[PDB]
Design a protein around this nucleic acid. Structure first.
Ligand SMILES: Cc1cn([C@H]2C[C@H](O)[C@@H](COP(=O)(O)OP(=O)(O)OP(=O)(O)O)O2)c(=O)[nH]c1=O
Ligand SMILES: [Mg+2]
Ligand SMILES: [Zn+2]
Ligand SMILES: [Zn+2]
Ligand SMILES: [Zn+2]
Ligand SMILES: [Zn+2]
Length: 1079
DNA sequence: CCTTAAGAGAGTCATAGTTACTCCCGCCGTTTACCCGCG
DNA sequence: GGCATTTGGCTAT
RNA sequence: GGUGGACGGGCCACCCUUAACCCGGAAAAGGAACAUGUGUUCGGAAAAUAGCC
DNA sequence: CGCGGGTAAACGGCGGGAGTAACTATGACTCTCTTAAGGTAGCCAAATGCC
């Protein structure tokens, strides 16, 4: 507990006095091992865990908190905070105690009949309150009565009694045949030839099943025989302190081997602490569980009244599978996909047939037949954990059944998908698994609907329905019936039913510890490309009936009755009973189709308007199938599509700061090196925050806090001074930076063009519940905040740009044309803005423009494997002119300290002096220079050039010039002079080369005498002291005869050599100072 | 052999505008306990 | 066997 | 005063005998499991549909 | 005596003015820096194809 600001702060420790609070933190970290020192301001004792924060506070500290101002007369009942006015207390309760203000609103809403003032007692009472209705109904037909009533109630009078029994009175083409004709016609020609004998018995089916299997094996034992090619290359005390050193080296080994083997899964071992455990549940337990789960045919009684969205479009299936279609789908398939239960990966298929012809034949043979071979209807299931909790490592549901099918079945399934997906247009409400940003269009739709309901004072009921095991419960009969009801061609229906025939899998738990076959009789084949589409098609009836017969939230003349994303469903309503209607429809579907939903796993809420505001859950919880829902009260949240929705505030903006700090701690505690931690962060941590930080509509306050945490952590990992420019971290690795992501400049751009994407969408219903002007101005705001043109702001409600297709009559069909993506405008290139900011700095940007877009001068920043990190960090410091030279140390402080060279007596000890001018390092300089010459020498010799290393030439004035190199081959003299010059401007290396060429152009008839040649070329070979490769040097490298790949390799080698020889020069300079100070 | 000015970023603090309400007030028509005409 | 090219992440379900 | 704690800075143990540690720009197992003191293992275990950067 | 119509008198609804807590955005400031491995070297990224 330091007492910032202090001049010679004693440690809260043994007692040693350190010279600075920062040095005190260093002493605590190293000598003691405490990383949580808290700093209290000297004046007011304000405590902050961050040092300089308190340091900056101190000057503006307005003395110790004294004589607390008068306490308002409104005290909160939760935190005892005083407020000046009643409105203040109400707003505090709303903004800090939502569960309290909710109940306050509910209590205020309820009416009563108190009648506080003017309670005129009626001498009438119960005894007569009922007797008067009885007697007024007694003597009826007699008009002009009361002669008996007054006797009944003599206590009252005549006219008033008459007043009282008034008061109380007041209250087609046969796609099979089409395929046959198409084949026949194509086979009469020589177009298709691979399997001509196996196609004729298919036309008039004789042994079609065996034809499928025989063709399969006859062409698949080949691709199997080449899997072994891949398997061949994949074959790969004295003292007790030795034990601890072995453990530490083992942890190192592990992490550094994973880092270069697969940096992925190392990101996940570090972050989320999810280890490589293999499930130890007995194979009998897993066997029985998954047998009873999957080998249990569902109960799909029927689809009832539920219909589907439109009719089928069988034209998609008519035209055949062409090689370019397979190429498109293969390029659209995940590259590093694991193999099925035979080992055949995508690479096997590609190598066995680069220009897909055999596959393009077998796929057509399957499709024309409606059957698939009995060797691909198999898959290997794996149980991969969900969390590393031993008590939950002995839990069955801590594992997932990821099912891997034969890849040649996954590819055919994708090909069949494209066509089935086109032929069956899903309901526009199903935003999952469709070609669109479903998650964004659902999160925005919810957020909006809620905000608009609150603003317009309209009831809104939301239920986050939860189907249990939607993919593992949807019966195959259900899918077949759904396909039939859309009148999809019976041939494709039969093909789908056959793709769901006699499937079995084994759930491998450990290496070679497999279960045996479990016939998958229920559920969609997870891992099969068609399964998402089939699930959407079997779930469409629910959405159709909900949108046609349910009662949903209305904004105008339209009604979103049910949003959906895959199995996720959100029911909406405009009343507590309309939501009961939607829930009843959902129950009907779930009881008629076999899907199971329980209100225990479902949540919801009900926003009911009041005079001032709304109330949440001011009613009984809805019941789904009998068990009441888990109504989400204010202050609680529910995860919808990865974001926490709180009915009190819409989207719960939380977790990003805590998650980022936890991840930074996890990375810092890893046995990784300074530039490996930066890679793990910029490639596997910041991306994880994008989704939440984008779809949650985070502002530039949290974005700046997160970016500040990232910057501090990175600059501490890399041992860069805090004053180092942001550009080096945020500039692209192609421009000399580290490539770290600037969230404050990225997330606004992502949000702006996400809003653009939502506005420019196909969901017509979705773009009616959307607040047009609010998102228009929000898009303008984010565009300006992202650094865009404040005048040329695109109109999100007009059209996108992109386009740029193969517009001119492309022979590619619609199934072969590569899928076109949409490219909405970006506000700006924030990375280029960061680099421009770098270039504008005058001291840390010295000559940085030479690294504008150079991949051969920044090759080391990306590929730094075999370089001591102590060298890499110094290279980074040199590139930003933040190396602790006395010139840099006396920055801003200026006169405060001396900038003179510590070794020589030069005016400024700039980073350029140490590398280029100081006599002390002259030896090293010479070595480096000669070394570079030698490299060039060797390169020239590899092309059989004669070399005159440092020749002794003399002119008339006896002025001996010594051109570093002279290459000669076939009557030519390439005089070359190497020079490693610090780059302090865009035209620095050019100037050096010009100087060399001008100072050696005197010797023409002298070089002719020495070299025995007539073509006396003169070239300067400038190199950057910080690793800048002059582009014109390629000319020389071309004259030597180097290839265009060895040219780039040698350019990278030269840049690396120059940079890391300058680093060594700087290190020698500092080490000489170190070795001389002790004297 | 070579070069030859530089602060930059991190952090509070103050001021002004926004969002999502809070609060009350007046009016405005509406219920409720006798009044009047009353056949 | 020199040359030419290429080379990732995250989110929802 | 010197050695050892892989290496540097500490800080410890011993006086050739080594128990415990901290930080690092250093750290590729004298660590665990299966077989008889020696070899093997420590998995690159991860699918699909869309989206995003 | 019943039946119509009027009725102050608190009070349910709805516009309207004023009002504030907690953010959200912009700007003006003010604060920090002195530490501390040397090193064989041998540029290999590293993989994959291709001709
Ligand atoms: C998360 C996830 C889901 N899906 C699909 C398959 C899943 O069956 C479906 C969602 O299933 P869930 O609804 O998450 O399964 P469940 O929670 O109902 O199971 P439980 O009985 O334990 O309650 O979405 C994927 O294809 N990939 C994924 O990564
Ligand atoms: Mg579910
Ligand atoms: Zn200490
Ligand atoms: Zn203070
Ligand atoms: Zn409070
Ligand atoms: Zn000098």
């Amino acid at each position: 507990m330091v007492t910032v600001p202090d001049k010679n702060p004693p440690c809260p420790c043994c007692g040693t006095r350190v010279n600075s609070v920062l040095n005190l933190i260093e002493h605590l970290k190293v000598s003691h091992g405490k990383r949580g020192v808290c700093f209290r301001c000297a004046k007011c004792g304000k405590e902050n865990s961050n040092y300089h924060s308190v340091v900056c506070h101190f000057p503006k500290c307005r003395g110790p908190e004294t004589e607390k101002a008068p306490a308002g007369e409104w005290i909160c009942e939760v935190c005892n905070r005083d407020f000046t006015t009643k409105i203040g207390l109400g707003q505090h309760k709303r903004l800090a105690h939502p569960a309290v203000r909710n109940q306050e609103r509910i209590v205020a809403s309820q009416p009563k009949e108190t009648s506080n003032r003017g309670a005129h007692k009626r001498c009438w009472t119960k005894e007569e309150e009922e007797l008067l209705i009885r007697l007024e109904a007694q003597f009826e037909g007699n008009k002009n009565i009361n002669k008996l009533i007054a006797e009944h109630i003599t206590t009252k009078t005549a006219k008033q009694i008459s007043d009282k029994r008034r008061l109380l009175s007041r209250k087609e083409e046969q796609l099979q045949a089409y395929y046959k004709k198409t084949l026949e016609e194509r086979l009469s020609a020589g177009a298709l030839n691979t399997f001509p004998r196996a196609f004729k018995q298919v036309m008039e089916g004789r042994d079609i099943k065996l034809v499928i299997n025989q063709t399969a094996q006859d062409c698949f034992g080949c691709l199997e025989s080449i899997s072994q090619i891949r398997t061949a290359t994949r074959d790969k005390p004295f003292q007790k302190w030795m034990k601890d050193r072995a453990i530490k080296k083992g942890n190192y080994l592990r992490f550094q081997r994973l880092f270069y083997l697969d940096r992925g899964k190392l990101a996940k071992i570090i972050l989320d602490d999810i280890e490589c455990l293999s499930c130890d549940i007995p194979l009998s337990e897993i066997y029985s569980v998954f047998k009873t789960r999957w080998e249990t045919t569902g109960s799909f009684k029927s689809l009832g009244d539920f219909k589907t969205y439109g009719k089928a479009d069988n034209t998609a299936f008519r035209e055949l599978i062409t090689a370019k279609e397979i190429e498109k789908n293969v390029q659209e398939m995940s590259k590093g996909s694991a193999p099925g239960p035979d080992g055949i990966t995508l690479g096997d298929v590609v190598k066995m047939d680069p220009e897909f012809s055999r596959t393009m034949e077998i796929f057509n043979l399957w499709l024309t037949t409606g059957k698939i071979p009995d060797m691909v209807r198999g898959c290997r299931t794996v149980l991969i954990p969900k969390s590393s909790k031993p008590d939950r490592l002995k839990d069955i549901n801590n594992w997932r059944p990821i099912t891997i099918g034969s890849i040649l079945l996954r590819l055919f399934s994708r090909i069949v998908t494209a066509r089935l997906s086109k032929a069956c247009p899903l309901n526009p409400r199903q935003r999952g698994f469709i070609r669109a940003a479903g998650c964004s269009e659902n999160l925005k739709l919810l957020q909006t609907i809620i905000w608009s309901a609150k603003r317009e004072h309209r009831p809104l009921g939301v239920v986050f329905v939860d189907i249990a095991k939607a993919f593992d419960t949807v019966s195959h009969q259900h899918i077949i019936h759904a396909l039939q009801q859309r009148e999809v061609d019976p041939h494709i229906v039969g093909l789908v039913s056959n793709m769901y025939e006699n499937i079995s899998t084994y759930i491998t738990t450990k290496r070679n510890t497999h279960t045996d076959k479990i016939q998958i009789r229920v559920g969609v084949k997870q891992g099969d490309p068609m399964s998402p589409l089939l699930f959407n098609l079997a779930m469409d009836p629910l959405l159709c009936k909900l949108e046609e017969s349910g009662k949903g939230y209305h904004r105008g003349q339209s009604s979103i009755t049910a949003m959906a994303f895959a199995d996720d469903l959100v029911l909406l309503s405009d009343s507590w009973e309309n939501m009961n209607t939607n829930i009843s429809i959902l129950e009907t579907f779930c009881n008629l189709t076999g899907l199971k939903t329980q209100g225990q796993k479902c949540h919801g809420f009900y926003i009911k308007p009041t005079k001032d505001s709304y109330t949440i859950n001011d009613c009984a919880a809805w019941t789904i199938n009998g068990t009441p829902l888990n109504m989400i009260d204010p202050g609680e949240s529910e995860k919808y599509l990865g974001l926490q929705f709180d009915p009190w505030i819409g989207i719960a903006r939380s977790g990003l700061s805590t998650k980022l700090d936890f991840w930074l701690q996890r990375i810092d505690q890893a046995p990784l090196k300074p530039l490996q931690k930066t890679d793990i962060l910029k490639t596997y941590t910041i991306p994880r925050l994008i989704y939440i930080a984008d779809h949650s509509e985070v502002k530039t306050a949290l974005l700046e806090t997160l970016d500040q945490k990232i910057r501090t952590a990175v600059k501490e990992w890399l041992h860069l001074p805090p004053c180092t420019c942001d550009a080096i971290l945020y500039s692209s690795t192609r421009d000399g930076g580290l490539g770290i992501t600037k969230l404050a400049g990225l997330i606004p751009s992502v949000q702006a063009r996400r809003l653009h994407r939502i506005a420019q969408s196909s969901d017509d219903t979705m773009k009616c519940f959307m607040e047009k002007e609010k998102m228009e101005q929000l898009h303008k705001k984010l565009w300006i905040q992202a650094g865009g043109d404040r005048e040329n702001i695109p109109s999100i409600w007009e059209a996108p740009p992109s386009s740029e297709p193969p517009n001119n009559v492309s022979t590619n069909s619609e199934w072969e044309a590569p899928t076109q993506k949409d490219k909405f405008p970006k506000p700006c290139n924030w990375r280029k803005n960061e680099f421009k900011k770098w270039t504008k700095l005058a001291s840390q940007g010295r000559g940085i423009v030479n690294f504008e877009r150079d991949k051969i001068s920044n090759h080391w920043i990306q590929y730094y494997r075999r370089i001591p990190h102590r060298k890499l960090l110094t290279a980074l410091q040199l590139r930003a002119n933040v190396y602790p030279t006395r010139e840099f140390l006396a920055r801003g402080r200026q006169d405060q300290y001396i900038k003179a060279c510590r070794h020589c007596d030069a005016d400024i000890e700039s980073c350029a002096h140490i590398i280029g001018n100081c006599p002390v390092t002259q030896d090293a300089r010479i070595k480096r220079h000669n070394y570079i010459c030698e490299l060039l020498l060797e390169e020239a010799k590899k092309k059989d050039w004669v070399v005159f290393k440092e020749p002794h030439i003399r002119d008339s004035n006896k002025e001996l010039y010594k051109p570093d190199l002279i290459f000669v081959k076939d009557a030519r003299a390439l005089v070359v002079d190497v020079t490693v010059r610090y780059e302090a401007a865009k035209s620095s290396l050019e100037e050096a080369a010009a100087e060399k060429v001008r100072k050696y152009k005197h010797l023409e008839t002298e070089v002719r005498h020495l070299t025995n040649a007539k073509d006396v070329t003169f070239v300067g070979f400038p190199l950057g002291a910080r690793g800048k490769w002059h582009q014109d040097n390629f000319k020389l490298l071309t004259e030597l005869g180097l290839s265009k790949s060895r040219q780039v390799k040698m350019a990278e080698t030269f840049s690396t050599v120059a940079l890391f020889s300058s680093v060594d020069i700087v290190h020698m300079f500092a080490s000489r100072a170190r070795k001389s100070m002790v004297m």
